[PDB]
């Protein structure tokens, strides 16, 4: 029948995607596990647009052009498998299932291979932008069956956010790759929110700035190198007054939530053996924050330095150093993010495209920023770039940051303001640039209590201690 | 027939356990997947001791007193399930399978429940001490079927290391709990090795100490508050000369290995939502070290501060500050370790005993130290202690450490020596003691781009913004 695609799952997110598609001249068939929301949606915001409803699953399936394109925006987990299982029999080879939910990539790897067995095409797609991003242009990160891409390309790229004419949507890669890349985006997200919160914390508890003053600093920083959506909303949150003129944010319970996609990145980093330390710290910091009552109790007993009113003499220098600390740390976190992507490409055998991934994150998504355009640029120039930090633009940024980065950390250190993300970024940076790390002692220790053996430095190879061989020493 | 227990798996580890049991007056039946190693072992080190061999699996099973006690010391994974599956039919209800290998606890949870279904008793046991620890007194951490404990108690406690008359072996708890606790011990281990390596690195690259000088510092520190096995072997490694008089350790390739048990703790911390940041950093640092060629390349291009010959004027003060940094950081890592244990007890419904776990880690194991005795003591006094840092002894240690801890970190920061573990410990400490963290902004941010909602501080509850309710604000 008539409908370019259908979408099941009519939460605000999916409704806005359908609306977005309709506005771009697609006929969309809207459906849900239930009914109330279909009729209601057709009655209100879908009215007078190219949006048709459905009553049955077979009705839905019947209203869709060939090959049938079935997008799901449902809760992750078994409900995704529920729909898939009741849709497969109503389908024929070459039809396309699109999971747009925040599904864990091994599930998408599985659904991909299972559907493939039946000749059904699978697209596991990341979607980012929130409610309003879905309405006007989300970031879309499709992966799965490559042969499904020519069929969803025009729908996806038309509705996606644009960055300098270019759509924020390219084919990510095979199997669970789209959801994988969406996962990492969410890990990076956690990192950027933690880094921003540390800047706020240092200005508040160390500098003694009012929220309006910290808001103005974010206003100022957004006008420069840190230009980004998260810095904008932070600027906006910090000046937001409660009904009583007092800053609303200072009344919020300081216990961070996490639905899960953030820990997944840290876990994956661990599985893959990549040092994604900042995202790790960002996840652990939310875990720390959850422990509200334990911290109230801790605050009454554990000592720390006094923060005098005059700890910051030069407020301009303080703020300028902090900007470089935030900015350099962010560069570390993203450099770590792309190391992860680099290792996952290699381990999973996925041909992940670094410029395209950065492009897809430039707009639509929560982490959108000018900074990301600069990442796209670096990888356009060298798509084989082994680390972001080997790019001149980022190497220069990090060189310029040196003094402000270290000064802000020593300052937070001296005055007892927690900087988990700033600290781990500098430690990683200083470790990463070390030709020789103290892991030589680590190896010696291991060979000592466990005879686990060790390799010799090629420049130290000798009679005993030969190159490319596992050496054990009797240390006793 | 005759044999208190049998042990399958005749690697050096298991051989030494059998030997240890024999010396304590047990008749042990030795067996292997194969034969050569059984005959060979009976021919040499088991000769003239109460150790008998076996030829068949049924032969092995027949030589064992009732209820039959079958210990496995084989490679983790499927080989453990292999043995179990071929032993179960040759067994009868109430017989006891003991897995002493380094098995991942969910596997032990599974084997426990499966064997339980057949009325077979299961013990998943941690074993720590290495080759020589197995020969004279390892740490043993049994968990599984409580009803198996009265049957293995005397064998286990007799052969285990002693700390002040007390055996380093108590019943850990149900299902996979023994292996769980062994896992965490190994996470803690990673942390202590990384912390030690950072002290070494700072003295070497920042202080410009020779290895003999750093060895003497560890000699000195081992005579005090840091008294421990790992500090001893480090002291010993650092003075160890290669065949050419040059320090051997400086020739070792600085790429750390990890068999896996270390990442498991960080992953579990993530699954459980506990801020086990130091173990995380220790695992990530090994991951960083593996990247040898990328770091050589990084070292040639990325800038950092110069370390002048006179960066350390006062070597005595430098060393004294560092000792407090190492010591305070270690206290953080262990405090994090027991938070993990605390959450796992609660989430899994396991009645984990904190004094007993600390006791079991006091001796035999790689992390053995006087420090651990002090942990046992703290939990004997208050077994309900919510955090180690609420204990006076540790609170005082951390109070005394303040100045040396922060000074060493600011120093490594200023001069560009990586201190991932020192840094994360201080950040965690400063976060943990904060009544209010900037997770209030995090929550505001989330409620803004995703309407995820937030709670109000009870002391800020009002007309709008009521207590114990999920608030959303229209920030725009």
Author numbering:
A (entry chain A), B (entry chain A): 1 to 476
Q: What does the publication say?
A:
Moreover, we determined the crystal structure of Gnd1 in complex with two citrate molecules by molecular replacement and refined it to 2.37 Å resolution. Similar to the 6PGDHs reported in other species, Gnd1 forms dimer. To our surprise, two citrate molecules were bound to the active site of each Gnd1 monomer. Previous study has shown that citrate serves as an inhibitor of 6PGDH. Our current research provides for the first time the conformation of 6PGDH bound with an inhibitor. These two residues were also shown to be critical for 6PG binding from structural studies of sheep liver 6PGDH.
Each subunit is comprised of an N-terminal Rossmann fold coenzyme-binding domain, a large all-helical domain and a small C-terminal tail.
